[PDB]
């Protein structure tokens, strides 16, 4: 939970600094400063490691060819006045703007489609960082975009400490070292800047350790299918 992370930061890592309040808990006024750094740390960990991969269904409309990955066009977000909401969200999968990289794209039946392929004029291109361009949209089709997902963003004004930070206990130290590095690096004092650099190096060492141990089952080899494809 966020309370545990705040206590851990207050005593042990952010101890000899103002934000830690001498190990008596993070002040209720410095929340929008640890939370901003925490969002960056969670984004870094969720982009460098595959801690959350999710899929989103994009319903194709006859007059729309550029589909934006924004919650304003979501089926569950009822606050938006968009006439056509092509994102197909469910109470289970909500699509809270947590998109880090669009990896794979499928169709309604389940056949993979090419992504960003120029020679094949049947591929789904990506114009901008959050858009999906379908040159050939059909009113009776739906996409099945799968992406690497981010942690649901914790608002800067969040006050409830029961908001759960969903990271494995192995990356707790990596996140904490990242937060310490980011908070220690703001000041231009050489002595404090050196500590910030040391925290950055230690965070990059923890990440290297987790990569070397593959605690998230990311770098796992697959069955070779090249002989079958080449006709052996």
């Amino acid at each position: 939970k966020l309370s545990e992370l705040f206590q851990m930061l207050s005593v042990g890592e952010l101890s000899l600094i103002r934000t830690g309040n001498d190990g008596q808990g993070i002040r209720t006024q410095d929340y929008p400063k640890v939370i901003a750094q925490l969002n960056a740390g969670l984004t870094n960990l969720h982009a460098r490691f595959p801690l959350l991969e999710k899929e989103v269904i994009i319903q194709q409309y006859e007059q729309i060819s550029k589909y934006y990955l924004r919650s304003e066009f979501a089926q569950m977000n009822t606050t938006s006045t968009e006439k056509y909401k092509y994102l197909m969200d469910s109470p289970t999968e909500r699509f809270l703007d947590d998109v880090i990289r669009v990896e794979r794209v499928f169709d309604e039946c389940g056949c993979p489609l090419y992504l960003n392929n120029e020679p094949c004029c049947g591929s789904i291109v990506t114009p901008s960082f959050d858009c999906i361009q379908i040159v050939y949209p059909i009113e009776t089709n739906a996409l099945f975009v799968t992406y690497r997902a981010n942690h649901p963003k914790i608002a800067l004004t969040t006050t409830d400490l029961n908001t759960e930070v969903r990271i494995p206990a192995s990356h707790e130290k990596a996140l904490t070292y990242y937060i310490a590095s980011q908070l220690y690096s703001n000041s231009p004092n050489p002595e404090t800047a050196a500590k910030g650099v040391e925290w950055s190096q230690r965070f990059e060492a923890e990440c290297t350790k987790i990569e070397n141990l593959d605690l998230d089952n990311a770098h796992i080899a697959q069955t070779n299918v090249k002989p079958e494809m080449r006709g052996w």
Binding site: I57, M88, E108, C109, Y136, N141
Partner: protein, 59 residues
């Protein structure tokens, strides 16, 4: 090109869109009951036992 009409996603989403009606049916089945009326006693018999509430109009 191929039009995907009646696939698994279509059926599941059609069921999902009608979840309010399904919940209403569940509540009607489990909570209360309706009064089913027939014309004669013969029909009362020709009625399934799930009709625990019956009214017969006779001359």
């Amino acid at each position: 090109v191929e039009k995907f009409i009646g696939t698994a996603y279509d059926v599941v989403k059609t069921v999902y869109d009608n979840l309010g009606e399904i919940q209403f049916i569940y509540n009607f089945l489990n909570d209360y009951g309706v009064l089913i009326t027939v014309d004669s006693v013969t029909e009362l018999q020709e009625l399934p036992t799930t009709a625990k509430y019956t009214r017969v109009y006779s001359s």
